[PDB]
Amino acid sequence: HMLEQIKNNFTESIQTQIAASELLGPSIEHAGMMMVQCLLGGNKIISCGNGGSAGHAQHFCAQLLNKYETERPSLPAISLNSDISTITSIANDYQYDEVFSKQIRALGHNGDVLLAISTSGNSRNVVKAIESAVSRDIPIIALTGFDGGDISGLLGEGDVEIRVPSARTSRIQEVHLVVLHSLCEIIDTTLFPQ
Amino acid sequence: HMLEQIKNNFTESIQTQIAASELLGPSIEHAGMMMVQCLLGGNKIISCGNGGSAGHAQHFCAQLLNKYETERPSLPAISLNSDISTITSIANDYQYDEVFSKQIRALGHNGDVLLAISTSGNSRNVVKAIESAVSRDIPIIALTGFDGGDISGLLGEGDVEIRVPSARTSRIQEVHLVVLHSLCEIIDTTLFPQ
Amino acid sequence: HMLEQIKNNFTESIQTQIAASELLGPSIEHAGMMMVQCLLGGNKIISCGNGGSAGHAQHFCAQLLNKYETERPSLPAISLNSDISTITSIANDYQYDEVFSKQIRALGHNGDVLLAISTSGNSRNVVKAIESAVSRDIPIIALTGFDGGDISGLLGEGDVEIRVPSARTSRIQEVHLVVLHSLCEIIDTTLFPQ
Amino acid sequence: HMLEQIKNNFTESIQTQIAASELLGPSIEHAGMMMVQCLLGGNKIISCGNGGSAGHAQHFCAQLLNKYETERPSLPAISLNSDISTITSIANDYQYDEVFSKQIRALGHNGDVLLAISTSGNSRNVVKAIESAVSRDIPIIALTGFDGGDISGLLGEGDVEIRVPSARTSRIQEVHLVVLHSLCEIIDTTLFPQ
């Protein structure tokens, strides 16, 4: 019956949301402060993700290059997924694991912040992106789920890992969206007290 | 203090999620059955949205043209937002309200289903898209929030409206994502009992 | 000296343009008639390309979903490159050679026409796309350069190959654009004698 | 007859190409040197366009974030068109004339170079982008056609205008592509003598 597995998705989401709130508090806070300090340093936030989680990465930087809730001037943010002709020209020219890493190598400045999103934490394009950013004195903000994948063993703490207590990609993406909206509010209320 | 307004976003999300589950049950069910019947009719699902809600529209059709949880052959789905050179060539050539309506006029077939997403329910591009689809014997699945906007007064019931009980765009987008994932599971479990 | 290698690019382009005109005449004609018959059959044109040649594929379908020179109703055309959340969700889920083939499997109808573009003729994503379309009674229009790559040995003639007499990717893309604009005019003048 | 209007497009293209070569020599040279100096200053090239000319803007920066002919490290380049979730979130939030200007306001640095492309020279999104960049000590490289539109009366010469001697959008886009490929070679041969 459809209606009950509908409620299951809502039930499981809420349960994941709750567990996430009880656990990801401090990590999101630190990431927010890192973002606020980055934007105030004259730097930019770089975002990237995997699959439909790449829509979230674009969703974040779109909220910054524009506005979230508090009307404000555009804040410097870049998505690495948004560029099609580059990805299709790197993903092939002609291989896909370095689609994001090459963009960071060129655009990344000392003081920028990498917002890396990966539900599994095992997307090679996002991993190499993180590897790249580490090489350039660039803080990482990693949104993950599951165990954290190979992402975990790539971070000290100029970086933050936000690991969602869930093993379902759908539930991880849903929590990630809440996290992204929280950061936006944090950035908004801090930089533009309205 | 950042950490408390973080929890607020989680609290408000959960509260919205709960209210949505208690109310949007039947509407999501009907939409699911309409989608399942559409795909079984040999037709396709057409999605479109506004802003970062346009990332959700692409997220859905990407879950279909590929896979959600159950591995399956690609299902016919199209996003109207995904096409850049068209939107930028309609949004200007040279005005933006008909970016989606013109795509439906050309691609839309009798039996297709329009997945229209709008947090405010007042995005003219999504409205005209719905107006267009009504003209072609095409069921509408409208994901909305707030009061439902002008979208509401455009639908009979070959169509469904799923209105999220919230007046915050962030909370509406978060619930919309849960709804989209539910439909994917509905489509998956129904068409491919795995 | 910059100014002379500038003129070289213009000289080489013109020379390639000329050679192309003297040779690709009939092939472009046939492709045009195939497109016109496709659109008149109630079918759609499917386009795809590789790299910055993927911008051309989108450029074509944008000219159709909208208008070229003669103002007209939108014609049914789809680009496989335009969909980001799908490619990034196929390119990884999680491998890239079937990003286009899977989209054709789902969306492709009997009577549609595949506009496959590849400067080298050796892009696996475009090849498998062609392989896929052959399996579905779908004419191929292949824009190539060099020797034609592996694309050549995949076509009978419900299909057309348009091979640019050049071994430089830049010169091939430049000629391809002229070819695309010719087809647009052909479609425009034939279907809407204005 | 189709075959003769095919040759007409080739004939007119070649004629436009020739006229362009005889006239746009110095302008392309200066733009190249400005780009080379920009990249050597530690700055980035910002590109934007209108419609299918927006595919060219992405095509250029993709050639830089990756490679053209000479294999090299990625060069810092950004397209303003590539970002979908932002444009759709600016184009509406909720109006379209400032989709590019807002991105320049946030990302634009002193020393960057704006590559503005417009066939008509009358696209308001590209105009305001130029207006924005002028306000920030940023050189403009404007690819235009026709009379140059309102773009012309917005430039001194820290900026360059490259006006194609043609009144046909198709012929202008074709010449623009040659110009873009010339600059790529200029940048390649100058910065990486291979």
Swiss-Prot record, chains A, B, C, D:
One GO MF term attached to the UniProt entry: carbohydrate derivative binding
Cross-referenced SUPFAM superfamilies: SIS domain
Cofactor: Zn(2+)
Quaternary context: Homotetramer.
GO cellular component terms attached to this protein's record: cytoplasm
Alphabetical keyword list: Carbohydrate metabolism, Cytoplasm, Isomerase, Metal-binding, Zinc
Organism: Colwellia psychrerythraea (strain 34H / ATCC BAA-681) (Vibrio psychroerythus)
Stored CDD domains: SIS_GmhA
Binding of Zn(2+), residues: 59, 63, 173, 181
Protein name listed in UniProt: Phosphoheptose isomerase
